[PDB]
């Protein structure tokens, strides 16, 4: 019995002694002092936080969204920051995302940097322009059998500093929406009723964010135009849940308001004297319209231009009036379109099949310098892969191949 008490006392004493030693060592070694961070060279808006923690969290608290979309993971980005002091160490986890040629310039991922000492950043000026507007929807009318156009008005008359081809960030809270409430004109409801898609419904639990390219160009002041597709489960896998934000965006009625952020963008045109070739299909119409309108009307460049668009059926074509007007007004721009698998009722006359095949057969097969001109594309992965392969086969270098990408 006397040994049980000894065992208890010795266990407690040994554990307590080890804990006290660890605490004393921690007190003597770790700094324990606050840190100061300068977001750039050298605004007065220095940030003072406690030691440790993630640099991404510190910037999010300061209000400079990187990114900062999810606060971790490093899955995608557009999650990079520039450092000129403090964080001079190199972490092995950043090399597989940052190339050797650009790592030496002092660029690091925000979600990887650790706040152990005072550091100074070199963020590009564009980041500081990020802020939100509570835009009011002008209209959300339907344009195709699976696509709608959303137009927004900036409150208080504020104008967005942006470059043609940019994209915005859309943020909405949790919601529950049924597909039966969609305001889809009967003109496009034939396939909807054939597939009985109105029976679907969606549920969201927490606020969500997404990115959307804008169909307007700078001369259109105070208006943000977006082209949105319906995230509908495939007929092969109806049991798959539908989209989380596309359903709410489609159900959204005119006159409502939401919060958008940005703009952001890197899919800008190059300032050369060479020809421009634009390729698109379905929802990709927004960046193409932005680029074409900007280049033709605002810049008034004489560079040769052309646009090639792919559609499922003759019912899927929109902006046709604007593009025909542009072609008539300017001899420097001419556009063509082809139907992948139109219905017999379309009574279509013209190019058919894949847009990439049509383009190669009609324009590039006879072009004298396919590599000289620049290629801009945005569309479904099926089209994108074929177009990339065809251009590589023709010998076009990556420096002249540019595209917008989406996924999930």
């Amino acid at each position: 019995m006397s040994t049980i008490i000894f065992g208890v006392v010795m266990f407690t004493l040994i554990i307590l002694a080890l804990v006290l030693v660890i605490l004393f060592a921690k007190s003597k070694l770790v700094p324990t002092g606050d840190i100061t961070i300068s977001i750039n060279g050298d605004p007065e808006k220095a940030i003072v936080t406690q030691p440790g923690g993630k640099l991404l969290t510190a910037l999010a608290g300061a209000g400079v969204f990187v990114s900062s979309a999810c606060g971790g993971g490093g899955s995608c980005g557009q999650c990079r920051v520039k450092i000129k002091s403090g964080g001079g160490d190199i972490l092995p986890t950043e090399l597989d995302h940052i190339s050797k040629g650009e790592a030496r310039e002092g660029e690091r991922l925000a979600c990887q940097v650790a706040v152990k000492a005072d550091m100074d950043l070199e963020l590009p000026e564009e980041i500081f322009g990020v802020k939100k507007w509570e835009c009011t929807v002008i209209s959300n009318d339907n344009k195709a059998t699976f696509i709608k156009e959303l137009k927004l008005a900036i409150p208080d008359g504020e104008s967005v500093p942006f470059r043609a081809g940019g994209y915005i960030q859309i943020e909405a809270p949790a919601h529950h929406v049924k597909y039966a409430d969609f305001d889809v004109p009967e003109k496009y409801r034939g396939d909807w009723d054939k597939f009985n898609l109105f029976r679907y419904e969606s549920k969201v639990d927490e606020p969500i964010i997404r990115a959307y390219s804008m169909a307007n160009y700078p001369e259109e002041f105070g208006i943000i135009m977006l082209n949105v597709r319906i995230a509908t489960p495939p007929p092969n896998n109806p049991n798959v849940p539908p989209g989380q934000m596309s359903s709410y965006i489609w159900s959204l009625k005119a006159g409502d308001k939401c919060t958008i952020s940005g703009p952001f963008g890197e899919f800008f045109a190059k300032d050369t004297d060479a020809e421009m070739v634009f390729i698109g299909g379905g929802a990709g119409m927004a960046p193409m319209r932005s680029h074409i309108f900007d280049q033709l009307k605002r810049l008034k460049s004489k560079r040769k231009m052309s646009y090639w668009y792919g559609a499922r059926s003759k019912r899927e074509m929109f902006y046709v009036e604007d593009f025909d007007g542009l072609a008539a007004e300017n001899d420097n721009f001419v556009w063509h379109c082809a139907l992948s698998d139109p219905q017999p009722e379309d009574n279509w006359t013209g190019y058919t099949g894949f847009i990439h095949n049509v383009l190669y057969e009609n324009y590039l097969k006879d072009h004298e310098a396919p590599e000289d001109c620049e290629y801009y594309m945005c569309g479904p992965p099926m089209m994108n892969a074929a177009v990339i392969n065809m251009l590589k086969n023709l010998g076009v270098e990556e420096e002249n191949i540019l595209l917008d990408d989406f996924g999930g």
């Binding site: 190339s99 050797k100 040629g101 004298e368 310098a369 396919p370 590599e371 000289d372 590589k392 086969n393 023709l394 010998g395 270098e397 420096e399």
Partner: protein
């Protein structure tokens, strides 16, 4: 001064007689677009266009400002493009004697010209493409400078010509080119040569260095490894002696000088010798009625690092100074691998051939075996005079470990620095392609 112990002088048959004679008439010349590393051409001509000597044919997208010009006056007759529309050659049919002209200077003024004036003249005339850069063996950017320009006044390739015979005819032009290079260098100019006498330049920048030994002793890679080790921070420029003569002639007479003196030799050449030709000449017409009957392979350059001259590529290379011709060994022999070959060459002592000193072989284009994994019996160490671990470096290249290859010294090498290693590989590997792939990767993502 410097003696190379490791190497190999290939005892191939048909060695040229070092005497210069007039060559056969040439009707077509071409510029080959695949022999310039990293070149992406922008064509400035089209089939049927008349051209003058030194007129621009195309530029480089990846190297702004560099011009590739016509060696002769005539008409563009072909523009050959291969897989993925890769440019193969631009063929010009000789006609007329039109040309573009430039400024003239006296021998006194050459050593004291502006680097900018020299650069503009060279670039405009198209002679700027004679230079190459270690690492990556690319044409220098027109806005860059190098502290070391290496002149190659020796040739140790098998069946190669004798630089002394050629230089003695153009001593004044050689000296003028040396003066221009001394003005252009910003460091020193290294004239790497053999133990015999050559015309000298009085400028203190120009230094003559003597190399002795078997083949690799005559390579710019070896010369740099021994006199100015190169790396990412230190880059040297390389130019051969005939290009130096061309530079001297350009700056002395104000017009491009496209003459060449190559060696036509090989086991199947009836009368090996040196012949006067023109830059980018047609090898098909050059070797007409000069070879024995049968199926033969014509090579632009040495049998160690040349280019097969077939069809669209049947034209003299830019950096090649010899034409090699040898038979095609498609024969199959019973137990040929087990014979006690008195007529079989090898750097190992497993054949009877090595016992007959001075023997000369009628070598063919055979791979004496099939592809296999590397079993390092120590052949590479016998032919590599540089301070490297050849077997480890080659295994690194084969595995594709570019970072470790750079650490082991890949940045100092050209495809022609591993020709002997490819030669003596029991597994029949070809390390030039692997080295080029690794260098391309380093350049692209570095």
């Amino acid at each position: 001064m410097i003696t190379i112990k490791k190497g190999l002088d290939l005892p191939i048959a048909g060695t040229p007689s070092q005497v210069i004679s007039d060559g056969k008439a040439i009707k077509k010349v071409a510029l080959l677009g695949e022999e310039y590393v990293g070149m992406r051409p922008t064509m400035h001509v089209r089939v049927g266009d008349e051209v003058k000597k030194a007129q621009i044919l195309f530029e480089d997208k990846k190297n702004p400002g560099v011009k590739f010009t016509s060696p002769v006056s005539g008409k563009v007759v072909e523009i050959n493009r291969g897989a993925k529309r890769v440019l193969q050659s631009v063929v010009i049919e000789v006609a007329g004697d039109d040309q573009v002209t430039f400024d003239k200077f006296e021998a006194n003024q050459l050593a004291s010209l502006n680097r900018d004036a020299i650069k503009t003249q060279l670039v405009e005339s198209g002679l700027w493409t004679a230079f190459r850069t270690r690492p990556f063996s690319k044409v220098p950017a027109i806005d860059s400078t190098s502290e070391a320009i290496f002149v190659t006044a020796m040739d140790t390739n098998p069946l190669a010509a004798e630089p002394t015979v050629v230089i003695n005819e153009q001593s004044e032009a050689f000296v003028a080119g040396l003066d221009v290079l001394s003005a252009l260098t910003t460091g020193k100019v290294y004239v790497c040569k053999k133990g015999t006498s050559l015309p000298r330049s009085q400028q203190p920048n120009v230094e003559e260095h003597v190399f002795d030994g078997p083949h690799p002793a005559g390579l710019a890679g070896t010369h740099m490894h021994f006199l100015y080790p190169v790396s990412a921070d230190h880059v040297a420029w390389s130019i051969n002696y005939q290009d130096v003569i061309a530079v001297g002639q350009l700056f002395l007479t104000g017009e491009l000088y496209t003459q060449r003196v190559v060696s036509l030799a090989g086991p199947v050449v009836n009368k090996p010798r040196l012949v006067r030709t023109v830059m980018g000449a047609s090898l098909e017409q050059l070797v007409d009625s000069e070879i024995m009957p049968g199926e033969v392979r014509i090579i632009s350059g040495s049998v160690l690092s040349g280019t097969k001259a077939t069809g669209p590529h049947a034209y003299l290379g830019r950096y090649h100074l010899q034409v090699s011709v040898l038979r095609e060994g498609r024969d199959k022999e019973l137990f040929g691998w087990a014979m006690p070959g008195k007529n079989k060459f090898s750097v190992t002592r497993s054949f009877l051939g090595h016992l007959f000193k001075g023997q000369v072989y009628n070598m063919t284009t055979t791979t004496n075996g099939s592809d296999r994994s590397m079993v390092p019996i120590g052949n590479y160490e016998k032919v590599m005079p540089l301070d490297m671990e050849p077997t480890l470096l080659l295994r690194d290249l084969c595995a594709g470990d570019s970072d470790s290859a750079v650490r082991l010294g890949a940045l100092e090498l050209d495809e022609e620095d591993l020709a002997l290693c490819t030669f003596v590989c029991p597994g029949k590997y070809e390390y030039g392609q692997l080295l080029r792939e690794c260098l391309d990767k380093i350049e692209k993502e570095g």
